[PDB]
Amino acid sequence: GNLEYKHPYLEDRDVKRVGYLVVSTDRGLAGGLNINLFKKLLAEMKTWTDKGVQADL
Amino acid sequence: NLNMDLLYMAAAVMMGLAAIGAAIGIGILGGKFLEGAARQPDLIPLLRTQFFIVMGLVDAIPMIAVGLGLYVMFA
């Protein structure tokens, strides 16, 4: 709406540190569900940290 | 002769009350109009036509008192 404000969570800024929440099982026998997710996370976490960004989990 | 001067005086007090009455009344009404515009700037032409429906009534009684103030000036 027209009554738009400024707020830290709405404002846009350049990444100097990055965070991920990550969900995993407590139980095995799920096949590769965890590992495939963790591989995809490891690629992006590598890509940002090569930009010098400390990752956080 | 005091008859002339005190007629001059009676217009001047009656005029000042009408000037205050109008100036304050539309100042208050105009303040809420500017709050509406700052809150809701899409509607300001709509609110403008509302503000002028109301503004004429605030003026109406003070303008009568100006009419008598100018007649007691004139006569």
Automatic annotation (TrEMBL), chain A:
Function in brief: Produces ATP from ADP in the presence of a proton gradient across the membrane. The gamma chain is believed to be important in regulating ATPase activity and the flow of protons through the CF(0) complex.
Location within or outside the cell: Cell inner membrane; Cell membrane
Signal peptide range: none
Protein family according to the UniProt entry: Belongs to the ATPase gamma chain family.
Gene it is expressed from: atpG
Subunit-structure text: F-type ATPases have 2 components, CF(1) - the catalytic core - and CF(0) - the membrane proton channel. CF(1) has five subunits: alpha(3), beta(3), gamma(1), delta(1), epsilon(1). CF(0) has three main subunits: a, b and c.
Protein name from the UniProt record: ATP synthase gamma chain
Organism: Escherichia coli
